[PDB]
Amino acid sequence: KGEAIRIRSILRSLIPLGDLVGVISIAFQMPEPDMSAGF
């Protein structure tokens, strides 16, 4: 289907891939307990 390709292209133009991998790479801290209302 072509409209599927168009929607996927729109989503890719909105959200790039480098942004996605950079956001994935944050390496959240893992703790003495901490708060679950953060990242």
Binding site: E3, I7, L11, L14, G18, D19, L20, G22, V23, F39
Partner: protein, 46 residues
């Protein structure tokens, strides 16, 4: 999904200002700013 995407692309202000628009760069900078706002208690409700 199609109509939701149509509406979200016709109205660009539904996305975050630091991700979409001529201001903020993108999701990376947006969420790093979000993390630093979370880290500094000077930008919350006392």
């Amino acid at each position: 999904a199609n109509v939701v995407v149509r509406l979200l692309i016709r109205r660009p202000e539904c996305f975050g200002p630091a991700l979409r628009g001529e201001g903020g760069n993108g999701l990376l900078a947006a969420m790093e700013e979000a993390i630093k706002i979370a880290e500094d208690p000077s930008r919350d409700g006392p």
